[PDB]
Nucleic acid binder design. Structure first.
Ligand code: DTP
Ligand code: CA
Ligand code: CA
Ligand code: CA
Ligand code: CA
Length: 903
DNA sequence: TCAGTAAGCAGTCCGCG
DNA sequence: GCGGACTGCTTAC
């Protein structure tokens, strides 16, 4: 086995490293690492070290890390650049692991845990930790066991032991339905007192010390509560045993409107799953309670209990413990699906960083670039202080609001990273500047050619063409990884549609799902066998195909995220390679490329149609264009097509054989015009959109920038079994829109696009009539809630108070005194409902924590005073009016001359 | 919410004879 | 009532 690190820390003049040795065993060492840094030197001094600009450097070896940091300070005092990696543990990792790391996850101890704390006087604050810890469940990935630490005796109640037999039973048997697959993996340990529980947990922790520590809200709650509770009972030295190096630090996390404290456990990598989910899932959720997310991700029923959580242990300890175990398992199920831990390990080891730094693309890229340059004996520049400055971004075309029947879209592959590679944009490849003409002059190819020597961007920057910069070199490696995983994702998607087709004709037989790799397109043999399978086997295969697609999606989208964040990092003042000349070089080239190709596509289609000045490109955003295909369809005539799939095939062929070669020609010319290093502007067909053949559907519509809906038959080569709505920007896509309203608006859109005006009017009329029956949660609006304190004036709204904040203040007056009542947390999300005039709450709206039922203290009065009319007009009718006006249809039947006859 | 720009809509405040 | 200046929040890239 090749060795690999687990964790690394700097403590004073020592590096503390946990690692897997050449034998597969976990080991720990303390190393008195001697760091090197660099200063510029005369050319007359012989050296093998050069900075990124080719200037010679001398290496300075320090006796210890504190000497190195002190030298940095003195160099600042003098006014001279101190070069090299100033994060010494990253230098250590680079020296110790000077090869591509291959890690073995089975050797990495991944721990996920959850704690329960009974509290009669509200939320148990981790900084205080004044209440006993009465349950801990800790899952260990190496043992594959759930360790349950259960407190039987508390000042808040003495209880009986948890029963595994009752836990295993159906909820309908009075059981807790702990999944059968984990029952045999539970190791249950009851305790007669809290001191005993905590002492044993720490000894356990010592034996099975987590490398990766995760769970749900562990960084903000579980870890600081456990640390502070042990501190309060035993003293700080005992609490520090949670760190394998016995070092901890209270870290203050600053935000815009306040701050919070977490505990840094040296020698542990905390990856809170809530944070992994928020950053890598590409969702925005109305609520981030584990119950809400588990329902969303896994389609598992809410964990139900009677009464408040503060009385659960006393009333039903059996269920209390079971639900603590289930909560731990749910995080493992989410990870089995989403694979964010796998993602973190992959990226972490690739970059050679602490695993927890995967949350920071700046730290990630700093390490990738440093390791890359080190291999060439090159020396990285010092980080400098820069003032924050705004800079321009992408171009977005103003569309003419309208219905659009037939649409084909085209999109540039990994645009910003492709621009970096094409132009050769890097700190060390800057060659100079040229005199800029207005952007429209480059778009229309009338400006003089920027350079005959260097590779250019329309912002005025020129770059060397003789060799690739380190940024293009390293961004390419990650792009190639992304491409591989996207390939797997798309194959699983295509395979999924094959199964969906086969499910139209399932066989009446008893059989098994096929043993296949869903990352690769199904062969003819697999397809034949699929056509003979039962619905039960097909559905299992569909589930597996969809799980493979999700795994591919995680892997690809987050590598895309990483490479796009490098382009972004060039515009962040804390990045070592911050440079607005390079950041703007990317964004400005992107603006040009889009408007250039818009002109080229318009010119090409006007030619094939024999017209002049006709606008075929109806819309574009950053790197995509949407092309009206109405004229193309009309050139053969709708009557000539056998079915929907026939015109879809026809447009697919037109895009691939006619438009893409024309687009490629346009970009090759643009590359030559800018004298770029390498043509990498690859714009491929994305969506084919239109109404069902022979229907009154409108196909698609735009209301304005970033606001449109399309009925899509084929997306990136995936031919759907059923048409899919592609809706961007509209209220159906916003987490702030009520759940039931999202659903109804989506059905309104489906009907508009697929069925037409009459169908739309039929559905609107019904929804307007029945909506008052919808559950209050399903019709509540959602909002994040920041700066609640600023707008609180004696419990009443101050000047310019936001509507959702007003609702919170209303709530806070209505629950006044009740220390048990759920408190709205600053920066979290709330449900919001409008209230009718003259209500007992004394205001026009009320808000409460999202993902929860409103407290029974005030639930009946809210339901009685809920303003359904205002709710309907604001969340449903107003957006729908927006859609229908843009698409030139009516949601209510207009009166005609036929209303004058028989009955 | 510790960890790039563009741009939409809700709502406040208040003008607009 | 609509719209402009503004805050707040949320998407699309
Ligand atoms: N989350 C983001 N952070 C920073 N920049 C972004 C982000 N999303 C998009 N961009 C910028 C960089 C992208 O290259 C550009 C176009 O976005 P988009 O078309 O969604 O992805 P892409 O072109 O990078 O990859 P794809 O190959 O999937 O189309 O907009
Ligand atoms: Ca398990
Ligand atoms: Ca793209
Ligand atoms: Ca069949
Ligand atoms: Ca795009």
């Amino acid at each position: 086995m090749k060795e690999f690190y687990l964790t690394v820390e700097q403590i004073g003049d020592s590096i503390f490293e946990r690692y897997i040795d050449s034998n597969g065993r976990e080991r720990t060492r303390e190393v008195e690492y001697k760091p090197s840094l660099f200063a510029h030197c005369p050319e007359s001094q012989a050296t093998k070290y050069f900075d990124i600009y080719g200037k010679p450097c001398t290496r300075k070896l320090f006796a210890n890390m504190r000497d190195a940091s002190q030298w940095i300070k003195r160099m600042e005092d003098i006014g001279l650049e101190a070069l090299g990696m100033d994060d010494f543990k990253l230098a250590y990792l680079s020296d110790t692991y000077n090869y591509e790391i291959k890690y073995d996850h089975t050797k990495i101890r991944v721990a996920n845990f959850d704690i329960e704390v009974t509290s009669p006087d509200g939320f148990p604050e981790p900084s205080q930790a004044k209440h006993p810890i009465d349950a801990i469940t800790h899952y260990d990935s190496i043992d594959d066991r759930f360790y349950v630490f259960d407190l039987l005796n508390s000042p808040y109640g003495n209880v009986e032991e948890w029963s595994i037999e009752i836990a295993a039973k159906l909820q309908e048997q009075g059981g807790d339905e702990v999944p059968s697959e984990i029952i045999d993996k539970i190791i249950y340990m009851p305790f007669d007192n809290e001191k005993e529980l905590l002492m044993e947990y720490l000894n356990f922790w010592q034996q099975k010390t987590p490398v990766i520590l995760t769970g749900w809200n562990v960084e903000s709650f579980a870890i600081p509560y456990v640390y502070n509770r042990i501190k309060n009972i035993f003293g700080e030295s005992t609490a520090k045993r949670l760190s394998p190096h016995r070092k901890t630090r209270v870290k203050v996390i600053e935000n815009m409107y306040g701050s919070r404290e977490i505990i840094t456990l040296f020698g542990i990598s905390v990856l809170d799953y809530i944070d992994l989910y928020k950053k890598f899932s590409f969702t925005n959720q109305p609520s981030y309670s584990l119950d809400y997310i588990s329902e969303f991700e896994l389609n598992v029923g809410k964990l139900k209990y009677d009464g408040p959580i503060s009385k659960l242990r006393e009333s039903n300890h059996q269920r209390y413990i079971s639900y603590n175990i289930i909560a731990v398992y749910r995080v493992l199920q989410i990870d089995a699906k989403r694979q964010f831990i796998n993602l973190s390990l992959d990226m972490g080891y690739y970059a050679k960083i602490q695993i927890q730094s995967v949350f920071s693309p700046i730290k990630t890229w700093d390490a990738i670039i440093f390791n890359s340059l080190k291999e060439q004996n090159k020396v990285i520049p010092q980080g400098r202080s820069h003032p924050v400055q705004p800079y321009p971004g992408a171009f977005v075309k103003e569309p003419i609001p309208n219905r659009y029947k037939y649409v084909m879209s085209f999109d540039l592959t990994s645009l910003y990273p492709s621009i970096i590679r094409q132009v050769n944009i890097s700190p060390e490849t800057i060659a100079g500047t040229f005199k800029v003409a207005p952007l429209h002059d480059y778009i229309n190819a009338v400006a003089e050619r920027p350079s005959d020597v260097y590779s250019c961007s329309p912002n005025g920057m020129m770059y060397y063409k003789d060799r690739d910069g380190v940024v293009p070199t390293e961004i390419t490696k990650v792009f190639n990884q992304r491409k591989e995983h996207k390939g797997y994702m798309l194959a699983a998607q295509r395979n999924g549609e094959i199964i969906k087709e086969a499910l139209h004709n399932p066989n009446l037989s008893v059989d098994e799902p096929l043993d296949v790799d869903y990352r690769f397109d199904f062969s003819d043999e697999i397809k034949e066998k699929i056509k003979k399978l039962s619905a039960k086997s097909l559905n299992e295969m569909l589930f597996r195909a969809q799980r493979t697609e999700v795994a591919g999606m995680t892997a690809q989208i987050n590598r895309k995220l990483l490479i796009n964040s490098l382009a972004g990092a060039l515009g962040n003042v804390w990045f070592r390679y911050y440079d607005l000349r390079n950041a703007t070089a990317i964004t400005t080239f992107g603006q040009m490329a889009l408007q250039w190709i818009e002109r080229k596509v318009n010119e090409y289609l006007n030619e094939v149609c024999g017209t002049e000045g006709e606008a075929f490109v109806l819309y574009g955003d950053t790197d995509s264009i949407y092309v009206s295909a109405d004229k193309i369809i009309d050139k053969v005539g709708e009557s000539k097509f056998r079915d929907t799939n026939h015109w879809v095939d026809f447009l697919d062929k037109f895009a691939r054989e006619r438009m893409e070669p024309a687009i490629d020609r346009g970009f090759r010319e643009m590359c030559e015009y800018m004298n770029n290093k390498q043509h990498l502007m690859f714009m491929d067909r994305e969506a084919i959109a239109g109404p069902p053949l022979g229907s009154k559907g409108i196909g698609g519509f735009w209301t304005g920038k970033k606001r449109y809906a399309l009925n899509v038959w084929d997306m990136e080569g995936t031919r759907y079994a059923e048409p899919k709505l592609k809706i961007m920007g509209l209220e159906t896509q916003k987490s702030s829109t009520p759940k039931a309203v999202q659903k109804a608006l989506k059905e309104c859109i489906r009907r508009m696009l697929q069925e037409g005006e009459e169908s739309l009017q039929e559905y609107f009329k019904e929804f307007e009539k029945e909506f008052r029956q919808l559950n209050y949660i399903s019709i509540a609006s959602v909002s994040s809630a920041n700066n609640i304190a600023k707008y609180d004036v004696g419990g009443f709204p101050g000047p310019k108070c936001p509507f959702h904040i007003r609702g919170i203040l209303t709530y806070n007056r209505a629950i006044k005194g009740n220390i048990d009542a759920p408190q709205v947390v600053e920066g979290e999300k709330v449900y919001v409902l409008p209230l009718r005039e003259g209500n007992p709450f004394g205001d026009k709206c009320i808000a409460w924590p999202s993902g929860t039922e409103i407290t029974d203290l005030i639930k009946d009065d809210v339901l009685h005073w809920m303003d359904y009319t205002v709710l309907l007009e604001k969340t449903f009718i107003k957006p729908l009016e927006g859609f229908t006006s843009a698409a030139k249809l009516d949601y209510e039947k207009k009166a005609s001359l036929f209303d004058m006859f028989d009955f």
